[PDB]
Amino acid sequence: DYDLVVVGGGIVGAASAREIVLRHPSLKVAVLEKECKLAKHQSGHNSGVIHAGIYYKPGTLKARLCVEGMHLAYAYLDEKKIPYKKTGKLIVATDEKEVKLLKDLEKRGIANNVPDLRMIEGSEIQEIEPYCQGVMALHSPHTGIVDWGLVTEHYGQDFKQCGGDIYLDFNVSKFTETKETDYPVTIHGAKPGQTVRTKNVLTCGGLQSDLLAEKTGCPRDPRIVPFRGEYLLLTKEKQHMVKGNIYPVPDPRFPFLGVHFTPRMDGSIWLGPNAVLALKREGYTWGDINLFELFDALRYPGFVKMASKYIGFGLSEMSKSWFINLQIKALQKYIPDITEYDIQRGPAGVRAQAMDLDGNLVDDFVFDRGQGSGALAKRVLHCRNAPSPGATSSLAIAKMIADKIENEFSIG
Amino acid sequence: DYDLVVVGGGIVGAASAREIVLRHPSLKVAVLEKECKLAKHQSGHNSGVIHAGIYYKPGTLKARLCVEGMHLAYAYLDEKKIPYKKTGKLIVATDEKEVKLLKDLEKRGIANNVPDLRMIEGSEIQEIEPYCQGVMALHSPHTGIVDWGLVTEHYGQDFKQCGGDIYLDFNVSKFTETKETDYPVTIHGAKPGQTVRTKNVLTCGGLQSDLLAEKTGCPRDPRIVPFRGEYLLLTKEKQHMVKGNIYPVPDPRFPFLGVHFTPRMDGSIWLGPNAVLALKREGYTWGDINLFELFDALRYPGFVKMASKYIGFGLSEMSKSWFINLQIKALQKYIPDITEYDIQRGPAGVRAQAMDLDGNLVDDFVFDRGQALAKRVLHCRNAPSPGATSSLAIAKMIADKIENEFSIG
Amino acid sequence: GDYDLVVVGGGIVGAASAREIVLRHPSLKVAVLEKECKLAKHQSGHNSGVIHAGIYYKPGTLKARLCVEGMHLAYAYLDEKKIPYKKTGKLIVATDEKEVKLLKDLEKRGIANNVPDLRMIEGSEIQEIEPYCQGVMALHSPHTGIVDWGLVTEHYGQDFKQCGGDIYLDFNVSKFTETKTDYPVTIHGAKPGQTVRTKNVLTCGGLQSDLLAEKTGCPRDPRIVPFRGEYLLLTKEKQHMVKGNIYPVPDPRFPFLGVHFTPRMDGSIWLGPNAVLALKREGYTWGDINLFELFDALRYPGFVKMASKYIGFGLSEMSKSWFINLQIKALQKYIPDITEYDIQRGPAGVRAQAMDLDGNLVDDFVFDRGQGSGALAKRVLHCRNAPSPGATSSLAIAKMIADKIENEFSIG
Amino acid sequence: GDYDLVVVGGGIVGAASAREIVLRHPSLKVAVLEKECKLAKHQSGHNSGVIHAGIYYKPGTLKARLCVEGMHLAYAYLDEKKIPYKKTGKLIVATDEKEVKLLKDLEKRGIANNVPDLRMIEGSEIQEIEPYCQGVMALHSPHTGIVDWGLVTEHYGQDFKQCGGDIYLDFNVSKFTETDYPVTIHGAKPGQTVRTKNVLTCGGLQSDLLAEKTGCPRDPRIVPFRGEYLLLTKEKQHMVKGNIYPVPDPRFPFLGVHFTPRMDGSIWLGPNAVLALKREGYTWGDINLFELFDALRYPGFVKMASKYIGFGLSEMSKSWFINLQIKALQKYIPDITEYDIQRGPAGVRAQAMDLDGNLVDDFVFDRGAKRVLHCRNAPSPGATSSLAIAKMIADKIENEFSIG
Numbered sequence A: 001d002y003d004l005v006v007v008g009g010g011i012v013g014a015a016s017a018r019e020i021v022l023r024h025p026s027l028k029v030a031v032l033e034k035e036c037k038l039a040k041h042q043s044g045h046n047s048g049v050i051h052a053g054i055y056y057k058p059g060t061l062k063a064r065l066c067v068e069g070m071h072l073a074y075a076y077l078d079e080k081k082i083p084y085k086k087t088g089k090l091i092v093a094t095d096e097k098e099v100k101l102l103k104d105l106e107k108r109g110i111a112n113n114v115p116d117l118r119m120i121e122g123s124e125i126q127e128i129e130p131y132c133q134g135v136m137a138l139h140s141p142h143t144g145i146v147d148w149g150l151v152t153e154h155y156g157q158d159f160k161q162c163g164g165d166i167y168l169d170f171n172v173s174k175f176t177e178t179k180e181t182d183y184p185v186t187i188h189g190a191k192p193g194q195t196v197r198t199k200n201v202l203t204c205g206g207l208q209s210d211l212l213a214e215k216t217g218c219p220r221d222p223r224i225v226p227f228r229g230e231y232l233l234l235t236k237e238k239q240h241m242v243k244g245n246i247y248p249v250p251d252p253r254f255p256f257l258g259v260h261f262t263p264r265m266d267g268s269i270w271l272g273p274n275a276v277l278a279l280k281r282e283g284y285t286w287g288d289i290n291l292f293e294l295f296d297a298l299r300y301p302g303f304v305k306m307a308s309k310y311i312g313f314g315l316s317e318m319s320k321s322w323f324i325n326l327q328i329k330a331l332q333k334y335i336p337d338i339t340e341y342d343i344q345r346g347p348a349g350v351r352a353q354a355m356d357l358d359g360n361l362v363d364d365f366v367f368d369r370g371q372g373s374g375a376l377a378k379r380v381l382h383c384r385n386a387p388s389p390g391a392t393s394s395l396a397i398a399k400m401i402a403d404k405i406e407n408e409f410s411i412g
Numbered sequence B: 001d002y003d004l005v006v007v008g009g010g011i012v013g014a015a016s017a018r019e020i021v022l023r024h025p026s027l028k029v030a031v032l033e034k035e036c037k038l039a040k041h042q043s044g045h046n047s048g049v050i051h052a053g054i055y056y057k058p059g060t061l062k063a064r065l066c067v068e069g070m071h072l073a074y075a076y077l078d079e080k081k082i083p084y085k086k087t088g089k090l091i092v093a094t095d096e097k098e099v100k101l102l103k104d105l106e107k108r109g110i111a112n113n114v115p116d117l118r119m120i121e122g123s124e125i126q127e128i129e130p131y132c133q134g135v136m137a138l139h140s141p142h143t144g145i146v147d148w149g150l151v152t153e154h155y156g157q158d159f160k161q162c163g164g165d166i167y168l169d170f171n172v173s174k175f176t177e178t179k180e181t182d183y184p185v186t187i188h189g190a191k192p193g194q195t196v197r198t199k200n201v202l203t204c205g206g207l208q209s210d211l212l213a214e215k216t217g218c219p220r221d222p223r224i225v226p227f228r229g230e231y232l233l234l235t236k237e238k239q240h241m242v243k244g245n246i247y248p249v250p251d252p253r254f255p256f257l258g259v260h261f262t263p264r265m266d267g268s269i270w271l272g273p274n275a276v277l278a279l280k281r282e283g284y285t286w287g288d289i290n291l292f293e294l295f296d297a298l299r300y301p302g303f304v305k306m307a308s309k310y311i312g313f314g315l316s317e318m319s320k321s322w323f324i325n326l327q328i329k330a331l332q333k334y335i336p337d338i339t340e341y342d343i344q345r346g347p348a349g350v351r352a353q354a355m356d357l358d359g360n361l362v363d364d365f366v367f368d369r370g371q372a373l374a375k376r377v378l379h380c381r382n383a384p385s386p387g388a389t390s391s392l393a394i395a396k397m398i399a400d401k402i403e404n405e406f407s408i409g
Numbered sequence C: 001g002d003y004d005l006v007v008v009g010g011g012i013v014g015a016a017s018a019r020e021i022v023l024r025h026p027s028l029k030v031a032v033l034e035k036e037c038k039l040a041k042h043q044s045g046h047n048s049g050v051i052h053a054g055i056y057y058k059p060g061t062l063k064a065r066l067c068v069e070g071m072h073l074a075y076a077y078l079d080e081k082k083i084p085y086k087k088t089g090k091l092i093v094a095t096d097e098k099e100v101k102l103l104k105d106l107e108k109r110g111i112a113n114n115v116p117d118l119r120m121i122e123g124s125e126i127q128e129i130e131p132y133c134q135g136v137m138a139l140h141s142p143h144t145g146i147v148d149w150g151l152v153t154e155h156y157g158q159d160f161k162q163c164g165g166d167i168y169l170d171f172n173v174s175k176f177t178e179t180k181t182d183y184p185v186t187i188h189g190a191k192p193g194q195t196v197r198t199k200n201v202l203t204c205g206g207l208q209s210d211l212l213a214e215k216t217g218c219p220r221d222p223r224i225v226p227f228r229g230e231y232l233l234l235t236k237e238k239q240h241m242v243k244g245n246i247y248p249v250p251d252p253r254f255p256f257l258g259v260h261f262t263p264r265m266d267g268s269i270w271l272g273p274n275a276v277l278a279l280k281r282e283g284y285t286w287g288d289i290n291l292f293e294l295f296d297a298l299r300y301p302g303f304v305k306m307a308s309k310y311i312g313f314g315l316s317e318m319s320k321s322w323f324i325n326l327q328i329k330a331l332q333k334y335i336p337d338i339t340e341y342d343i344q345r346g347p348a349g350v351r352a353q354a355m356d357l358d359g360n361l362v363d364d365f366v367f368d369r370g371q372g373s374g375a376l377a378k379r380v381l382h383c384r385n386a387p388s389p390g391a392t393s394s395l396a397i398a399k400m401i402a403d404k405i406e407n408e409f410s411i412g
Numbered sequence D: 001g002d003y004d005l006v007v008v009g010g011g012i013v014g015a016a017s018a019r020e021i022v023l024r025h026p027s028l029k030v031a032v033l034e035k036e037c038k039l040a041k042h043q044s045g046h047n048s049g050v051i052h053a054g055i056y057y058k059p060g061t062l063k064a065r066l067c068v069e070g071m072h073l074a075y076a077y078l079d080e081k082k083i084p085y086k087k088t089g090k091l092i093v094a095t096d097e098k099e100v101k102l103l104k105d106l107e108k109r110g111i112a113n114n115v116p117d118l119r120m121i122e123g124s125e126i127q128e129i130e131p132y133c134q135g136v137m138a139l140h141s142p143h144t145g146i147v148d149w150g151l152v153t154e155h156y157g158q159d160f161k162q163c164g165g166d167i168y169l170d171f172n173v174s175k176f177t178e179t180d181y182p183v184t185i186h187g188a189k190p191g192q193t194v195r196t197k198n199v200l201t202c203g204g205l206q207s208d209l210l211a212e213k214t215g216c217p218r219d220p221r222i223v224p225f226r227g228e229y230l231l232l233t234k235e236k237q238h239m240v241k242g243n244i245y246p247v248p249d250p251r252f253p254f255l256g257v258h259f260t261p262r263m264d265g266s267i268w269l270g271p272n273a274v275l276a277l278k279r280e281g282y283t284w285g286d287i288n289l290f291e292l293f294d295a296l297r298y299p300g301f302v303k304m305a306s307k308y309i310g311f312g313l314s315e316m317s318k319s320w321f322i323n324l325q326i327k328a329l330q331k332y333i334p335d336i337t338e339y340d341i342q343r344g345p346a347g348v349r350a351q352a353m354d355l356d357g358n359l360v361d362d363f364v365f366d367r368g369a370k371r372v373l374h375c376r377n378a379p380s381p382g383a384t385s386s387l388a389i390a391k392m393i394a395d396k397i398e399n400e401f402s403i404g
């Protein structure tokens, strides 16, 4: 049936399958997606921001992939004529304690060759953002916005135009060895009789990458810990208050960039996302929990270790979500004239945050295969984590994943 | 934009929208479905059985709808060349107390003109199911199996071929009196600028029929109480032990038919469905809990009343679900050589069980309308069971209702 | 100091054993440690008040003789101390022919156990004993009576104190240590400086017998699983409808006798007790949950095995407890003119039900000691379980325990 | 079994009030009912054991006067009855310049309350009183002391019995009925009744529940706040000599986790203020579903939570993870580690809350059966001001019931 099957129709799975068929036009490739459309999850519930590569440690692959992907993204958006807006970014420091870290971000930004990075303070802050306070600001004019869900759909259309097959409504449930065939791996869906046979498998399952890796025989670690990213909607009567992206100076101990003011493609102004621990892999709303997710995430050895040191930051995120009057006061340090009457609760996304046994939040590439003999081992590779930000670096991530499965499966 | 809009892409919403455009080929009709495809919920997570109409009280509309819908369905499957199998059904009794209840089902099935219902003695059971036990059984040779999701999609294509528009990914969130116009009702989705104008609306929202009715001004009752229906997967090494449908003798006090043996179009044998109270409206996943949906299901004044009488039967369902060994012990009364190692927990559906203030499990049509939006939005908050088998007959009923209600034609 | 022997537990078993030993050996210096500020605050003070005759128990067993002997010892002790009691009698009523088969099994065990004046009663003779009670056949035990077992326990204590024994109320035993020489065991209370030294220790800690046994190195099994026993009160206007004890025919697979009609000493008629799994060791109130004692009742290996067979029997007890109307319908099989409006919710007790690793509800004697040769392993004996019924069998249990520690500790 | 007045509650407030009223009116037949089998089983027997001096409280208010007078009456009572105490001075230590301004506020309020002999003490001077303690500035209250308040409560009850009062232990007041003595009080045991002309309630953690039994509004509700203590190892008890208190947030009635010696020489660290999920929830795992539902559904709860949830979560997190509590304590005693502390006992504060979310710290009296008065709250600190609180309650009883 297929030489290679990619499980996962997100932006990482779609860009991977697209990059693979472009390199190898004779390879019969399929994509299996449990939902009925691409980019239903992480790739369709994001900030829509095209990152430039400021915060990332210089000389590392993460810093390279973001700057790589950003230029590859803008070029791809021009090639396919996908709408986008280069709104620019302002990382605003509110006190002299945040300018010590802001200057560190300036050094990292320049070393990563972020285009046109410049530090700014005084009245120049109100030149870019007339309603924004702040001691000192970092200006990144090439940070833009886009619909990453629409981009993912274009990845799938490019994949199909090269002969690729996309199976929507295909919930991968089990892998089995084919009867003694040239396609030794059959993939089973949740619907009876729904199967697909293949030589090799790559999985890009986002919020369920650890669960997918277990069905091949991989260890439970790194576990995917869901972090809900909630957004607030600024009222249309005050959408003029922000023009581009206004980011805070975040704590560099964590990969999160903090709650930020970001315009959407349709003109809306979204405030977020935050980082509240979800009690469900797809916990898009508060109170939508899964008890197996609760009992297993709390008993995961890495969980207690991270909470032992960073319980305060997580509780502060949840408290500011429970009572948005605490959130708007944090937002008034940047835009003071926003009140509780100007914001409403908006939609949310869920980060697939990888975590090791020590409690560290994994931000590197993690590829994994089972420990069998063995047909389901050796032939099923699981991409359990890709470096952030996955949407901006998607085209650069795809080239790394294409190299990985080429060396792992002897293709080309 | 449209004259009538049907909210709900399930089998009941699709069949009604298809029936009304076939009766009135000049009506501009649309379908709004919050998901990305049709039959994503009840119509796509069912037992796949074409019921014959045995259990239902003679003379009632429910009894007529199931036998008529069953005949209309088989004609539609032949008409569209949709795959199906007439596997037949056995309703097996295991002791003599169950025999009395079985004899009542024979009288009802004969009064309902179920063709061709016959009672067989325990010796003749193995002529139909060689591995099944039992002292007596009711034999329904025309009970069948089908992919109701594929049938629901064919309803939509028929609807599309007649000129109807299907809006997928349209999560109806608000109804609005149109500002200006010949289309007084506006329907708002969850996305900005996602609207559709209409003259009349019919909702068939399944698990959210009560929440949809509330948006017009209808009372919170009857409430939709979700009942999870779990399925067990039998290994292929024992699939040969079940030829057709093997059903137990159920308690006539409830609308549930019990955990049964049923082949899929796959040929694989599924054991179910369950009848476990769900802690979430769309609680397909086992441990999924919604605190709002659970606290509202338990604070509903009808919940404590029905639980005060029948919580024992509900508790027996969950313990057999918690401990599969107890469910295996029950199924061995029919197929003895099946152990716990022969099964695996499979997917589940969620029944949209309507319930009034008195705790009754409503099992008939419930239409509702506000006290603009009150006269032009009709909500079908419940339809008679079984919805899939009777879908074509239910749609004829529903088309009759909105034809009189909205003066269509 | 201090003492030769210390009995931990001020219940009816610890008090009776301590009373029996000082009577056998008047020169022995014995003390009783009880954590509450009074005797018999738990099981011995929250019971049905019934003096059992010894009908249900297997002939030839030690449990069968202890209850028959204990009942004769109890009435003799009650007369001697002028403690008020009432020989109300007991009717074990069968309602169908299946319970009739189980009833004559009970009668034959009662005859073999030498239960005095046991007579099988039939049809209309039932109304001569209980005019308002129905049934198809009943077993009549005229010598089954009622008493305040809590008052009996305090009488054991005053007998103990009159013979020179010391009672330490408000002494919560926290740990045993070696006195590094005339009294090698030191017992520590909760408050610092609250210590007592002795040569040998017997524990009768009821709901915490397993927790006490772990403190000197014994295994966690058999673990005490708490079963709340709830009672309902009949309105005074209908007390006349119940003259004596009216019991149902129980399932012999379980130690529990069913919900029964029992008059109290003040003329009250109590309906109970049931057998509902407590979510807390001392869970006398519904809703009182202890996360530790709950999460360790489950996850205990014997629990899931026991539930995998009998979960339905426990849930029916719960369903009738939550919905009193379901309990009244079952009680109407015996007394029909009793409605839901005629009853009130009353107090509850909690059974200290021992459970082995296989999931069996242990109902016999269980002793335990440390696994070494040191002071703690050799000088501390734990009674992890006493046979049912503990209150009726107390005087007989005491002589067995007295015989046991006489051999184990070379006393006398 | 018949009495003129019955006091429900055998804590320090109920015992001191019953003692005060029989001393004023020796012919009044008075009884006290206590549901436990001993006095001072709860708040009065699970406290910091500190005799406060009256530093934090606003001058001119009833709180500031009752504590200063109460501690003077307490010291005189302890000397008269020969009850052991130690008189280990207090040190309220500020650790940053942002804390010295709040400490100066406590000094101005302390001198206005006439706390002897309050004196602001500078950084170099801190080691002269606590050699191991850090700080940039501190407030020295040498007359603050320690005592076993449970032993004091039992001495109140003995004075009450010596004057002819009857103490009914193991008497769980469950119901009030009309019966001379028109009020009949029922216990939980069969046939356990007393009759009386008037009733006074001092039910601590169940004061709001007792007020409901006679038909009073459910507000103010008692919200339980568990107060956990940590135990310093014996090897480092020499590192603190007396009370070492921090500079607390003046918006709340809590004084914060502090270093405090006990009568046996032990050093206890606490108490914190974590929301308990049970009225008598002395341990973290011990919760009550009913006494969790209603505390959340109480209209005042979410109002206070919407403003100060961060302070409650900070308390809980430091309780869940000891390392975070140690880092806070190291600002005062730097050379202690997790190996130097162990988890200790806990108390539960009967914190009264109004419908607006305010933590009530004043007197609250509630009449119904019009012969039943419920003291739903007494001002803090209840133990130190016990004898002063009793006189006020005695005045209220004499005017409400016309005794004398």
Ligand SMILES: Cc1cc2nc3c(=O)[nH]c(=O)nc-3n(C[C@H](O)[C@H](O)[C@H](O)COP(=O)(O)OP(=O)(O)OC[C@H]3O[C@@H](n4cnc5c(N)ncnc54)[C@H](O)[C@@H]3O)c2cc1C
Binding pocket: A007, A008, A009, A010, A011, A012, A013, A014, A032, A033, A034, A035, A038, A039, A040, A041, A042, A043, A044, A045, A046, A047, A048, A049, A050, A051, A170, A171, A172, A173, A204, A205, A206, A207, A208, A212, A229, A273, A348, A349, A350, A351, A352, A388, A389, A390, A391, A392, A393
């Ligand atoms: C709140 C939020 C905001 C973000 N903002 C930005 C931003 O501004 N800029 C940026 O560059 N990045 C951003 N990101 C990151 C970006 O969204 C992700 O890195 C990226 O979407 C990851 O893509 P993915 O395909 O790996 O995950 P997904 O998009 O979630 O893809 C996983 C897919 O696998 C499918 N799947 C899972 N299990 C199975 C199975 N068993 N069978 C079949 N299919 C299965 C799922 O249905 C899903 O479609 C944001 C992320 C979040 C959470």
Ligand SMILES: Cc1cc2nc3c(=O)[nH]c(=O)nc-3n(C[C@H](O)[C@H](O)[C@H](O)COP(=O)(O)OP(=O)(O)OC[C@H]3O[C@@H](n4cnc5c(N)ncnc54)[C@H](O)[C@@H]3O)c2cc1C
Binding pocket: B007, B008, B009, B010, B011, B012, B013, B014, B032, B033, B034, B035, B038, B039, B040, B041, B042, B043, B044, B045, B046, B047, B048, B049, B050, B051, B170, B171, B172, B173, B204, B205, B206, B207, B208, B212, B229, B273, B348, B349, B350, B351, B352, B386, B387, B388, B389, B390
């Ligand atoms: C476990 C199970 C087994 C069954 N087995 C059988 C069987 O063997 N035989 C048989 O005949 N019947 C069977 N049934 C019954 C049958 O499946 C249902 O009666 C039938 O599918 C009901 O159709 P429906 O369209 O009303 O429900 P649904 O299919 O649930 O349709 C509701 C639709 O409304 C949509 N919707 C809801 N809210 C909104 C909104 N705000 N905006 C837009 N769209 C919205 C939902 O997305 C959904 O697609 C079974 C049912 C269950 C639960």
Ligand SMILES: Cc1cc2nc3c(=O)[nH]c(=O)nc-3n(C[C@H](O)[C@H](O)[C@H](O)COP(=O)(O)OP(=O)(O)OC[C@H]3O[C@@H](n4cnc5c(N)ncnc54)[C@H](O)[C@@H]3O)c2cc1C
Binding pocket: C008, C009, C010, C011, C012, C013, C014, C033, C034, C035, C036, C039, C040, C041, C042, C043, C044, C045, C046, C047, C048, C049, C050, C051, C052, C171, C172, C173, C174, C204, C205, C206, C207, C208, C212, C229, C273, C348, C349, C350, C351, C352, C386, C389, C390, C391, C392, C393
């Ligand atoms: C609901 C119910 C009804 C019953 N009805 C009857 C009946 O009708 N007839 C009959 O014959 N029997 C009856 N029984 C059985 C009888 O009540 C018990 O078998 C018996 O009372 C148990 O005696 P015990 O002293 O071992 O238990 P307990 O009375 O519980 O004594 C244990 C004591 O040890 C103390 N303790 C525990 N840990 C420590 C520690 N660390 N330090 C100090 N002290 C400690 C406890 O505080 C307690 O006082 C009934 C039991 C129950 C639960």
Ligand SMILES: Cc1cc2nc3c(=O)[nH]c(=O)nc-3n(C[C@H](O)[C@H](O)[C@H](O)COP(=O)(O)OP(=O)(O)OC[C@H]3O[C@@H](n4cnc5c(N)ncnc54)[C@H](O)[C@@H]3O)c2cc1C
Binding pocket: D008, D009, D010, D011, D012, D013, D014, D015, D033, D034, D035, D036, D039, D040, D041, D042, D043, D044, D045, D046, D047, D048, D049, D050, D051, D052, D171, D172, D173, D174, D202, D203, D204, D205, D206, D210, D226, D227, D271, D346, D347, D348, D349, D350, D381, D382, D383, D384, D385
């Ligand atoms: C952790 C903590 C530390 C403290 N530290 C200090 C300190 O250092 N200095 C200081 O001055 N103060 C301190 N306090 C305050 C002091 O302990 C209390 O203010 C004081 O004990 C209140 O006394 P009370 O009698 O009102 O409460 P309680 O002592 O709780 O008395 C209430 C009594 O009523 C009884 N009761 C309740 N319901 C019924 C019923 N239905 N029938 C019969 N009886 C019933 C209870 O059994 C209980 O004995 C502290 C408090 C806490 C919680």
Ligand SMILES: CCCCCCCCCCCCO[C@@H]1O[C@H](CO)[C@@H](O[C@H]2O[C@H](CO)[C@@H](O)[C@H](O)[C@H]2O)[C@H](O)[C@H]1O
Binding pocket: A248, A249, A250, A251, A254, A256, A257, A258, A259, A260, A274, A275, A277, A303, A306, A307, A310, A311, A312, A313, A314, A315, A317, A330, A331, A333
């Ligand atoms: C297991 C449970 C424990 C949870 C595990 C640890 C969770 C850690 C969460 C990391 C926090 C999310 O990221 C955090 O976002 C906040 C909120 O914007 C940022 O905070 C920043 O911006 C906000 C406004 O947005 C300002 O008011 C604030 O003064 C400033 O610090 C932090 O600089 C950043 O670190």
Ligand SMILES: CCCCCCCCCCCCO[C@@H]1O[C@H](CO)[C@@H](O[C@H]2O[C@H](CO)[C@@H](O)[C@H](O)[C@H]2O)[C@H](O)[C@H]1O
Binding pocket: B248, B249, B250, B251, B254, B256, B257, B258, B259, B260, B275, B277, B306, B307, B310, B311, B313, B314, B315, B317, B330, B331, B333
């Ligand atoms: C909301 C809380 C309270 C819940 C409310 C009550 C829920 C009602 C559920 C009714 C039970 C479901 O339907 C019930 O299915 C079971 C299981 O097949 C049938 O049971 C029958 O078949 C099974 C095999 O499956 C046999 O082992 C069993 O002996 C026989 O009685 C019952 O006859 C039928 O009544």
Ligand SMILES: CCCCCCCCCCCCO[C@@H]1O[C@H](CO)[C@@H](O[C@H]2O[C@H](CO)[C@@H](O)[C@H](O)[C@H]2O)[C@H](O)[C@H]1O
Binding pocket: C248, C249, C250, C251, C252, C254, C256, C257, C258, C259, C260, C274, C275, C277, C306, C307, C310, C311, C312, C313, C314, C315, C317, C330, C331, C333
């Ligand atoms: C921990 C989870 C699993 C729980 C473990 C299993 C618990 C088992 C408890 C056994 C039940 C208690 O004991 C059980 O009481 C019931 C109810 O009175 C008795 O029932 C009997 O009397 C009652 C009236 O009281 C009648 O309505 C009934 O028809 C008759 O059978 C049973 O004969 C007896 O077996």
Ligand SMILES: CCCCCCCCCCCCO[C@@H]1O[C@H](CO)[C@@H](O[C@H]2O[C@H](CO)[C@@H](O)[C@H](O)[C@H]2O)[C@H](O)[C@H]1O
Binding pocket: D246, D247, D248, D249, D252, D254, D255, D256, D257, D258, D272, D273, D275, D304, D305, D308, D309, D311, D312, D313, D315, D328, D329, D331
């Ligand atoms: C119901 C949910 C919401 C809960 C409601 C809000 C609860 C508020 C509780 C108030 C906090 C308890 O009291 C609080 O104790 C802490 C910890 O000692 C004190 O904190 C002080 O001392 C600690 C060490 O002890 C120092 O590390 C700290 O820098 C200093 O501020 C606060 O000054 C005081 O305000």
